Amino acid sequence: IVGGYTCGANTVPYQVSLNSGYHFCGGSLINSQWVVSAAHCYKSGIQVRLGEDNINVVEGNEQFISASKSIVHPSYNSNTLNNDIMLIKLKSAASLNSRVASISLPTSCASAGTQCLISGWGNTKSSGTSYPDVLKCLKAPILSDSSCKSASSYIITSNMFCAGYLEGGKDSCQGDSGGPVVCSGKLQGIVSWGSGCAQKNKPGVYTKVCNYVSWIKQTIASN
Ligand SMILES: COC(=O)[C@H](Cc1cccc(C(=N)N)c1)NC(=O)CNS(=O)(=O)c1ccc(C)cc1
Ligand SMILES: [Ca+2]
């Protein structure tokens, strides 16, 4: 997260860290047995880390659970990143509490202008490299497709939406991928991609979760 602020220990209870010997992507807890993340974050040997704040110090509220199954979206395209979403099932159900909670799936999509909360342990520098150990937060609005495409020349599909500030300075970044974009209490986005970080006229691109609720619900019911 570039230009954000220290969230505060466990203030984003649904945020998870995907670990394969080190943190490599974020994710969202949607229930006691399932996590949603980005398809390009797929890797084998994933261990889900819940209740985290400082990812380098055991603080006492963490729950480390291995993934028993990973399901990348059937139409995921790594070339354009269309349908960049994936579900991960935990080997054992997580214990829900004040510091480990699930986030609700959307009933309908969100309109441009809506404010959202984006969080992650990604790079905090715009022109350099610096990774935080504590979770960083960032409030940003949903931009209209027209203003996004016009300003960035990005090739965006109906399964993506842009969020951020065209003036740059604030944006998600490397290491934040797979993380949540929560607006009005619902999980509306998954950090997907972008061009550099916090660049002028280059806002972040997110997976439009409202378009996948049926697939998500169906997949968890049958798995
Ligand atoms: C540009 O260089 C990168 O390393 C970015 C970082 C990044 C990741 C997530 C969000 C942001 C952001 N600014 N909000 C930035 N990664 C990527 O963007 C993802 N991998 S990528 O750079 O390989 C890529 C990008 C776009 C397509 C169609 C295909 C592949
Ligand atoms: Ca920790």
15 annotated to bind ligand: no
Q: Where in the chain is the domain with CATH 2.40.10.10?
A: 1-12+103-210, 13-102+211-223
In eight-state DSSP terms, residue 214 is: H
20 is catalytic: no
Find out if CATH 3.90.1150.10 is the number for domain 1-12+103-210.
Answer: no
Give strand ranges (E) for the chain: 5-6, 15-19, 23-29, 34-37, 47-50, 63-72, 86-90, 115-120, 136-143, 160-163, 180-183, 186-193, 204-208
204 CA closest ligand 1 atom index: 14
Which residues are CB-contacts of 185 (< 8 A; sequence separation ≥ 6)?
A: 104
Whether residue 196 has its Cβ less than 6 Å from ligand 1: yes
197 CA closest ligand 1 atom index: 13
- Calpha distance 3→67 (Å, rounded): 32
20 annotated to bind ligand: no
Nearest to 110, CA basis, from 140, 83, 138: 140
193 CA closest ligand 1 atom index: 18
Nearest to 87, CA basis, from 159, 35, 25: 35
How deeply is 157 buried, as exposed, middle or buried, from its count of CB atoms within 10 A (0-12, 13-18, 19+)? middle
Q: How far is the CA of 192 from the centre of ligand 2 (A)?
A: 24
User: Which residues are registered as beta bridge partners of 171?
Assistant: 2
Q: How far is the CA of 77 from the centre of ligand 2 (A)?
A: 33
How deeply is 73 buried, as exposed, middle or buried, from its count of CB atoms within 10 A (0-12, 13-18, 19+)? buried
Rg (the chain; Cα; Å): 16
With the C-alpha atoms ordered 145, 148, 149, 155, is the resulting torsion angle positive or negative? negative
Instruction: Copy the structure tokens of residue 129.
Output: 């490299």
Query: Which ligand lies nearest to the CA atom of residue 82 in the structure?
Result: 1
Q: What is the Cα 101 distance to its own chain's centre?
A: 15
- Calpha distance 11→135 (Å, rounded): 9
Q: Experimental method used, please?
A: X-ray
In eight-state DSSP terms, residue 22 is: S
What separation in angstroms does the CA of 180 have from each of 25, 172, 196? 11, 11, 19
Catalytic residue of the set 23, 37, 40, 53? 40
Domain 13-102+211-223, CATH homologous superfamily name and number: Trypsin-like serine proteases (2.40.10.10)
Which residues are CB-contacts of 159 (< 8 A; sequence separation ≥ 6)?
A: 82, 83, 207, 208, 211, 212
